[PDB]
Amino acid sequence: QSITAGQKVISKHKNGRFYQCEVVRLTTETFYEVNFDDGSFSDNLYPEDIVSQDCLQFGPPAEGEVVQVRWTDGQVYGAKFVASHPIQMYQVEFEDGSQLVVKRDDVYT
């Protein structure tokens, strides 16, 4: 059913193909969901991208909180705090020795 470290699994390598992977490590890692004032959203945001208050030091904003967010072009947009998504991530390793931190079962089993 569910995964632990040392386990063989199948997940995508950076070359774009699926390979055997051994999960070397498990980390919980949190993302932020926001409501951009342009009617779009994002839930794959790192806490550091909320520039209006320190969330990496004090925790998520209040829900519905007005917030400033550095988008992936490093430019700062107005949003509105939706939610904080605590996800279990999986660091795997391939035979060439590469390694990627990953989600689902984006590590199939």
Partner: peptide, 7 residues
């Protein structure tokens, strides 16, 4: 809402 890839 939409997913967001702009810029």
């Amino acid at each position: 809402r939409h997913r967001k890839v702009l810029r």
